[PDB]
């Protein structure tokens, strides 16, 4: 039976530290969630499941504003918002989706609610903003586009039915006028941003916690099937270029001519971008329950359920550094942007990390 690997013994090549940390409510606790922080213009925006949202100065982590989104929703005077998908920031708005099928847009200036919209299903995946439009993929197989200005639904597209409960985020992505979205039925779809016109669909499944969010790089769509297989598709046609039948893949990123991934057992691998030949596999974190990986200052970084960050050399998969950060553990994604590394612990605490 599976068991967590021991903490690796690492001779630190450098000594990473915590720049600052700041509480954000009660976080996500032991609930599954995709909720993570956003960074824009030297401000960190982060939230908890209950409904608290904070803006923090990115240099010291001090609160700039806060807002509680919990509202009355029945007999009792207050109920949690169940914030899930997000946080996303664009154009002076902070966007967050909820398990109660609400999407909120907050002003970056002061945290006040600009608009709130009832969407077709649970909004468990991050809002994605493109061309004055907030794309929401609901857990119900719906893709909806909301106007950035007033939150009205401009168009809705049916991807397949809601009868399954796949753990794993499924955000849309956009490329050159089109949205591309994965799913639970094993199909990837491309639709035009203009009015939701379907361009193509492709099946990548046949017949666990997989992020089915597609990644488009230089005219190629990279996508995980709900069972963890990695496939590359032609962006224009949806034609399958290759498929790599790994027993499973949970999370991946694409950089240069490589794909870096974390599988269902927490092995970390580098593959070639063209056909994903396996350059190296690092298995010393087996069953430690990793986050998605990010690249930061040229290293691959992942967090684990015990609250460590692990820094990995992309050339050979070796560890170059290890740091203990937060005892409540790490489950959502680390965020690497604007020269900073941010990550939110399960109890809600947000960290900025210094290489």
Instruction: Please report the resolution in angstroms.
Output: 1.8
231: Cα within 13 Å, side-chain hemisphere: 26
How far apart CA 138 and CA 210 sit, in angstroms, is 16
Query: In 3-state terms, what secondary structure has residue 183?
Result: coil
How far apart CA 271 and CA 313 sit, in angstroms, is 14
How far apart CA 17 and CA 29 sit, in angstroms, is 24
208: Cα within 13 Å, side-chain hemisphere: 13
DSSP for 19-81, written as a single string? EEEE--TTTTTTS------EEETTEEEEE-TTSEEEEEETTT--EEEEEE--B--SSSS-B--
Centre a 10 Å sphere on the Cβ of residue 23 and count the other Cβ atoms it contains: 17
87 contacts 38 by C-beta, under 8 angstroms? yes
DSSP for 302-354, written as a single string? EE-TTSEEEEEETTT--EEEEEE--TT-B-S--EEETTEEEEEBTTS-EEEEE
How far apart CA 39 and CA 80 sit, in angstroms, is 24
Contacts of 41 (CB under 8 A, 6+ apart): none
How far apart CA 343 and CA 289 sit, in angstroms, is 15
How far apart CA 234 and CA 86 sit, in angstroms, is 28
168: Cα within 13 Å, side-chain hemisphere: 26
Residues paired with 304 in a beta bridge: none
How far apart CA 313 and CA 62 sit, in angstroms, is 33
Tokens representing 10 are 């690492």
> Which residue from 252, 249, 246, 223 is spatially nearest to 235, judged by alpha carbons?
223
DSSP state of 130: -
How far apart CA 167 and CA 183 sit, in angstroms, is 11
> Which residue from 128, 200, 138, 202 is spatially nearest to 166, judged by alpha carbons?
138
For residue 324, how far is the Cα from the chain centroid? 22
Residue ranges per structural domain of the chain:
1-355
How far apart CA 122 and CA 128 sit, in angstroms, is 15
278-282/187-192 β-pairing: unpaired
Centre a 10 Å sphere on the Cβ of residue 78 and count the other Cβ atoms it contains: 12
| 205-221 per-residue burial string, b: 16 or more CB within 10 A, e: under 16 | beeeebbbbbbbeeebb
Q: Vertex 338, ends 334 and 342: CA angle to 5°?
A: 25
Tokens representing 297 are 């200052």
How far apart CA 41 and CA 349 sit, in angstroms, is 21
């Amino acid at each position: 039976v599976v068991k967590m690997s021991p903490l690796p013994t690492v001779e630190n090549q450098f000594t990473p530290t915590t720049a600052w940390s700041t509480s954000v409510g009660s976080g996500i606790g032991n609930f599954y969630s995709n909720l993570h922080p956003a960074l824009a213009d030297n401000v960190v925006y982060a939230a908890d499941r209950a409904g608290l949202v904070k803006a923090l100065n990115a240099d010291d982590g001090k609160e700039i504003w806060s807002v509680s989104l919990a509202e009355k929703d029945g007999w009792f005077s207050k109920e949690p918002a169940l914030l899930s998908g997000g946080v996303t920031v664009s154009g002076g708005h902070v966007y967050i989706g909820s398990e109660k099928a609400q999407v909120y847009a907050l002003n970056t200036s002061d945290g006040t609610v600009a608009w709130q919209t009832k969407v077709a299903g649970e909004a468990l995946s991050r809002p994605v903003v493109s061309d004055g439009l907030v794309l929401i993929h609901t857990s119900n197989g719906q893709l909806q586009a909301l106007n950035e200005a007033d939150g009205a639904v401009k168009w809705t597209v049916n991807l397949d039915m809601p009868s399954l409960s796949l753990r794993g985020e499924s955000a849309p992505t956009t490329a050159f006028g089109a949205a591309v979205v994965g799913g639970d039925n094993g199909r990837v779809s491309a639709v035009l941003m203009e009015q939701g016109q379907m361009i193509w669909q492709q099946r990548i499944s046949q017949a666990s916690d997989v992020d089915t969010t597609p990644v488009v790089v230089n005219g190629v769509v990279f996508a995980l099937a709900y069972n963890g297989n990695l496939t590359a598709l032609d962006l224009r046609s949806g034609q399958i270029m290759w498929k790599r039948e790994l027993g499973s893949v949970n999370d991946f990123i694409v950089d240069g001519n490589r794909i870096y991934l974390v599988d269902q057992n927490d092995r970390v691998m580098a593959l070639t971008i063209d056909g994903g030949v396996t350059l190296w596999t690092q298995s010393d974190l087996l069953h430690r329950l990793l986050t998605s990986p990010v690249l930061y200052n040229g290293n691959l970084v992942v967090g684990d359920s015990e609250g460590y960050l692990h820094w990995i050399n992309v050339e050979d998969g070796r560890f170059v550094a290890q740091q203990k950060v937060d005892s409540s553990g790490f489950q959502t994604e680390p965020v690497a942007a604007d020269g900073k590394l941010l990550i939110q612990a399960k109890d809600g605490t947000v960290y900025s990390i210094t290489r």
